[PDB]
């Protein structure tokens, strides 16, 4: 207890006599609140550590988180004491309780000059050393956007981001996901001067196939995208899910990024934009699936494929109506939708309007104004695979309000499915009271009050 306040304050030739008395008190390398003689280098006691080196003290502390003697100095401001500690061949590979070497503290805490002190020695330490999840010392300079700590590591310690972590990510991936727009700049320019070039970083593969332009739109930063496009990345490189970056944008609604990559690579608009992935969805499908009515204006203006089919055989009009995006199905109709398509169960768009609670008066008002109505109201009487016309779907599911509109527009009342059942046979079967009552008091209500079916 004598050398505790002595090596922290006196630290020259009288603390060393007090530490000779502290070794005479109990012994040297005795425990304390922190560790054994860890408070010397915490206060930059060079001569007291030289007397500790003269008495051959311990060079491996266990201060309740295994913060060793080198790690306890860099955690504080002990810039000069490490120059003696690294002249001594001390072990520089012990991991803390948080699995950190003393290199992983000088970057995670933005200790700039403490890296330079470690840079003059450079052969007693290891830079490709596995940290938290196997993140090396250049992953942590890419997460937290410490551009100067990444500036020191790549040109002095002679590193290149070819060391993936235990999940597959390279340091160009971690810098691009976290929108580290400044840290990405020093890889593409100051990393060229070592042997890890621009065209070679830009083609790194993740655990899913993510080129770092895929990981530039997981982060949603417009500046980190154009860094990847200046370095020559193609917007056609597909994932393991066969998705391009033009699929990943446009599913977010990033209108500013989909037009930016069409300005820098005008060649790829033919090779992409008709580039069906797994689940066979063109980039126009992905923008209408998630109700983005401003991208689907842009993509058709750039020459899209407005009614291209997919897996499960759905046009982008049918795909945007099964998701109940009603702002984007009014837009596709006034833009050349070709409303005659039917999916794998022969359901047209009026099947999806009624079974999703969509408003039908202003829907038919759109087709009337788009002049298709001349005679394209034969899809009111159009059966699906099971024979059910869209008036069967109204009576089966309640929907009193939309039942009146089908009758007002002239749908056939007594139209029978494959089991020869009128919609009144559906309405009576599920107990729909008000549906029955407003079928009967219309026209052809006296004809259908007592009408059989297949069973009689």
């Amino acid at each position: 207890v004598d050398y505790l306040e002595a090596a922290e304050s006196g630290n020259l030739d009288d603390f060393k006599r007090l530490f000779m008395a502290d070794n005479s008190r109990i012994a040297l390398k005795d425990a304390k609140g922190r560790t054994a003689a860890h408070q010397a280098a915490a206060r930059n006691r060079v001569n007291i550590l030289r007397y500790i080196r003269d008495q051959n003290g311990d060079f491996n502390a266990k201060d309740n988180a295994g913060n060793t003697p080198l790690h306890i100095a860099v955690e504080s401001d002990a810039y000069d004491a490490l120059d003696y500690l690294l002249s001594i061949p001390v072990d520089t590979g012990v991991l803390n309780e948080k699995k950190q070497a003393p290199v992983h503290l000088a970057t995670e805490l933005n200790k700039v000059k403490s890296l330079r002190v470690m840079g003059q020695y450079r052969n007693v330490i290891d830079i490709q050393q596995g940290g938290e999840h196997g993140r090396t010392a250049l992953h942590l300079a890419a997460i937290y956007d410490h551009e100067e700590c990444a500036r020191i590591l790549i040109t002095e310690f002679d590193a290149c981001p070819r060391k993936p972590c235990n999940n597959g990510y390279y340091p160009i991936h971690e810098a691009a996901k976290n929108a580290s727009s400044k840290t990405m700049e020093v890889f593409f320019q100051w990393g060229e001067q070592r042997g890890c070039t621009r065209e070679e970083m830009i083609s790194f593969y993740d655990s899913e196939g993510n080129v770092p332009l895929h990981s530039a739109v997981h982060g949603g930063d417009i500046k980190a995208v154009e860094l990847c496009l200046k370095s020559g990345a193609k917007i056609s490189t597909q994932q393991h899910d066969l998705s391009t970056p033009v699929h990943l944008a446009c599913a977010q609604g990033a209108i500013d990024i989909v037009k930016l990559m069409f300005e820098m690579q005008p060649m790829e608009k033919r090779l992409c934009l008709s580039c069906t992935d797994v689940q066979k969805m063109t980039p126009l499908h992905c923008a209408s699936m998630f109700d983005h009515p401003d991208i689907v204006s842009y993509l058709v203006a750039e020459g899209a494929d407005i009614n291209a089919l997919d897996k499960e055989h759905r046009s982008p009009l049918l795909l945007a109506a099964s998701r109940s995006g009603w702002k984007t199905v009014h837009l596709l109709i006034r833009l050349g939708a070709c409303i005659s398509v039917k999916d794998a169960a022969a359901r047209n768009v009026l099947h999806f309007v009624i079974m999703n609670g969509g408003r039908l008066t202003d829907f038919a008002e759109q087709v009337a104004n788009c002049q298709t109505q001349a005679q394209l109201k034969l899809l009111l009487n159009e059966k699906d695979s099971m024979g059910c016309s869209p008036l069967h779907y109204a009576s089966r599911d309640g929907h009193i309000r939309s039942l009146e509109n089908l009758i007002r527009l002239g749908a056939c009342i007594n139209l029978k499915n494959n089991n020869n059942e009128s919609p009144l046979h559906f309405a009576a079967r599920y107990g729909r009271y008000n549906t029955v009552r407003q079928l009967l008091d219309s026209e052809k209500g006296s004809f259908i009050i007592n009408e059989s079916d297949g069973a009689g």
Partner: protein
Amino acid sequence: AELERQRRKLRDISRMLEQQHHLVRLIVQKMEIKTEADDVDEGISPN
């Protein structure tokens, strides 16, 4: 013999509570149109 104390819970919720839904639907009839309730019909759902 506790089965007669399995009907005393449904003697009240089918005469007071089931009427209680009708009293408040009588109130909101006179002020403003509700959208969830009076756009579907009575009966049993197919699913």
